[PDB]
Design a protein around this ligand. Structure first.
Ligand code: FE
Ligand code: FE
Ligand code: FE
Ligand code: FE
Lengths: 194, 194
């Protein structure tokens, strides 16, 4: 059960999350919970760790900038983090809020949430499952989601590669700064597109 | 004259380059020479340094991989360079061949050639002139070159930003590895697109 990792039941957790997140975002988290279970089954990852990590990945999405800055200082995190914003913070910093609120100490689940947005050059299969589940969950309808889903049915690594390439492409298209760890992920995984 | 920087006249140089480079590439170099002069006039950069740097920027485009690897070892350059290829090498390593062949020791011209492909987080106006001239020279006809030309008529910094964003976008679109120094340039200049 989820209580093997956190300080409350799944239902109690959902009730807490319904207070923290808008409807669309909680619906998304439920979608990632389901998608992570499916991917974990397919690729030999613990389905319970994957489900929980999926449900929790965006738990800190609505923390204020000020709250994130306080956490960077309190946990003496990479000071370069202050130069970024919610997109980077909600996973990379938000894990500390999740830990405080839920008594989540499982290193694998924490890592998968930590890097769910930006990836890393080295990712566990659990990390990859969450990173991909976030992109392909059933509520997503962006053009090309069908391609992502097809790739994810066949190769976890190729799905990471595809998502990362689309993210870098899109950020450059929009003229948004690209977190350097995102490029580490991109360069490590891009060979899978061949 | 060019002899103030290199060991031969401009005509002698053109004759040497016509032996090293295919026609299309030499035509390109002549185009960059002209475009760099125009940009240097516009943005207060020495027109002669810009012209020469522009003519020379792709001098090493046809060196073999083996030749580049030999240069990395001989000059004890960043060993990570061996993980890349001609796109990175012809500027970043090719400067040493240019120096050997032409007795080019001007630090500013060398730097502008060195980073003409990948940029840097900090670029001199001369570096920026070459980086942009390469992209907008009259023989180029890629879709969107008109936009690049318009931006370059107004802002050197915005032209660097635009070119860098299009390069990152394209590399991710194609599924090619992105040299990390390219991301340094991108992140440093992307604010100019606003
Ligand atoms: Fe997220
Ligand atoms: Fe999400
Ligand atoms: Fe070049
Ligand atoms: Fe060129």
């Amino acid at each position: 059960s989820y209580q093997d990792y956190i300080n409350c039941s799944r239902e109690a957790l959902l009730e807490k999350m319904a207070e923290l997140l808008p409807e669309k975002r909680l619906t998304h988290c439920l979608g990632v919970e389901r998608a992570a279970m499916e991917l974990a089954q397919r690729f030999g990852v613990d389905v319970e760790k994957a489900s929980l990590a999926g449900l929790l990945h965006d738990y800190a999405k609505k923390l204020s900038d000020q709250e994130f800055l306080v956490l960077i200082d309190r946990y003496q995190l990479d000071p370069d983090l202050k130069n970024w914003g919610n997109n980077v913070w909600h996973g990379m910093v938000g894990i500390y809020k999740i830990q405080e609120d839920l008594d989540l100490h499982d290193s694998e689940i924490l890592r998968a949430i930590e890097i769910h947005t930006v990836g890393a050059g080295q990712m566990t299969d659990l990390d990859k499952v969450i990173y991909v589940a976030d992109y392909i969950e059933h509520n997503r309808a962006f053009p090309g989601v069908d391609v992502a889903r097809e790739i994810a049915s066949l190769s976890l690594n190729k799905a990471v590669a595809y998502e990362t390439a689309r993210t870098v492409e899109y950020l450059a298209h929009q003229g948004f700064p690209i977190y350097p760890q995102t490029l580490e992920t991109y360069n490590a995984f891009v060979h899978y597109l061949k």
